[PDB]
Write a protein that binds this ligand. Sequence first.
Ligand SMILES: Nc1ncnc2c1ncn2[C@@H]1O[C@H](COP(=O)(O)OP(=O)(O)OP(=O)(O)O)[C@@H](O)[C@H]1O
Ligand SMILES: Nc1ncnc2c1ncn2[C@@H]1O[C@H](COP(=O)(O)OP(=O)(O)OP(=O)(O)O)[C@@H](O)[C@H]1O
Ligand SMILES: [Ca+2]
Ligand SMILES: [Ca+2]
Length: 489
Amino acid sequence: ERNEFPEDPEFEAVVRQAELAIERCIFPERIYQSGSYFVKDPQGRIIAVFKPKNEEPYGHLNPKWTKWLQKGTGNIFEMLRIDEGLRLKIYKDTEGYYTIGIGHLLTKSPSLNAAKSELDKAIGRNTNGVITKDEAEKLFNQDVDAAVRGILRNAKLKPVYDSLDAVRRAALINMVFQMGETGVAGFTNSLRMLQQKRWDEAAVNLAKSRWYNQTPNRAKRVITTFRTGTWDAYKNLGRDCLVLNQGYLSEAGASLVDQKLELNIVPRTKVVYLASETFNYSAIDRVKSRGKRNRIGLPPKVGSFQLFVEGYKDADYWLRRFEAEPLPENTNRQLLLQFERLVVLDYIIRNTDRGNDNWLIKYDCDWVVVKEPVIKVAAIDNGLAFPLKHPDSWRAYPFYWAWLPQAKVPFSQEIKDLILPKISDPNFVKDLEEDLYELFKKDPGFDRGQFHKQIAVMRGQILNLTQALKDNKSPLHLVQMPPVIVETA
Ligand SMILES: Nc1ncnc2c1ncn2[C@@H]1O[C@H](COP(=O)(O)OP(=O)(O)OP(=O)(O)O)[C@@H](O)[C@H]1O
Ligand SMILES: Nc1ncnc2c1ncn2[C@@H]1O[C@H](COP(=O)(O)OP(=O)(O)OP(=O)(O)O)[C@@H](O)[C@H]1O
Ligand SMILES: [Ca+2]
Ligand SMILES: [Ca+2]
């Protein structure tokens, strides 16, 4: 609640100006180019980027999913479209029964002619197994009504149904849609627990059936729907190596890793609580804000707070110009030294999303002070890192800078002198795991099981990076090393 950071007085000062700006009604404006805002000072100057947890792509208050929110059982349509898909020609389901459109069962007969007959009757014309999308939607609407009708007609199903919330009702409709009224009623045990609100208890013994066994992926989506009562199971059906809704922790974790490695390319990021009318709040929070305690106001949202850096442009922008009109050797070397730090950071944390759009470059054209560098790099948008595992398809989530010509240059001695003494030291790696733990555990949805996997991947990255640095490998040869995890038994 209290954004205090004795370790970092400049950062705490920047946060204070953000709080003061909000009080004077200079609110952070939405970046929108979804859950990110340009935090400003009282003078209107942008001072940081803020990304609240509940507004992330998986966030419950994500403005992108709010449409889904109000509809609610009305989402059974889109829910079933995701589970059933669309096919304009007759096909066999998992049970081997003829089907068409959006999961519309035609018959249990092995005869394709009997199926075509049932189809012609349903559509009202000679289709020969082929229908249009509109015809599929019509049948789909009918099948949905029939599923609801079967529910409300049944004596065993109705009691469980009206006692359920809007979201959990769609889950029951889903089962009735797939198995029918008679079949779903056969789940006497699971139906009772659902009635008594015993969500976890029910989600367990629901997996104890041919339904789960026959179609596990579908069952898992529907069961978790019964468990959590949200639409999370249908938010991102591709497969994900990243944990659910912890992007802010990834943004902060990236800064933590960078600082301990002394990389200094990630603008300082930390977990910060902010309240702002410009943010997306629930209706219940909006109404209560105008109560009298001075008003109660809006609850401060938790999220990642990252300091804004000035003078930078897209890495794509600068790499573009450099490719055309190459930098002088001395400047290009400075650029390469920065690139190496970016490579080390992304590999250790395993950033899945680091295109030339996710890092910035600042190009500016006998003593006790070091002469200032002409070029500098900033690693931004580090919300999609610290994966639970290596991606099933590296092509889907690759290190994009690996395809850059800079990635072919061998690791300099300077980057070796900086990193090797740290990661090769098991005491350093242990403390790093500890710091990440204290940061990650703060999250309510924190899973100790997930964390051990995140660390196993990181330790696997450190293993390859250590040897790659010793062998003077380039970043490209580094990524080409077979990904591995160091798991504890
Ligand atoms: N620390 C920073 N300093 C300066 N500019 C920044 C910083 N972070 C982000 N920006 C600017 O804000 C833009 C968007 O930020 P970011 O990518 O983090 O937002 P996002 O919500 O993740 O959006 P996207 O969908 O593009 O990833 C960047 O293109 C960059 O121009
Ligand atoms: N841009 C990248 N991002 C992440 N990993 C990469 C990248 N490029 C190469 N690799 C890793 O290096 C290994 C060898 O890459 P290579 O260019 O030989 O592809 P490949 O072996 O032809 O394709 P496949 O990985 O399907 O065997 C891959 O298994 C991959 O894990
Ligand atoms: Ca981005
Ligand atoms: Ca992003």
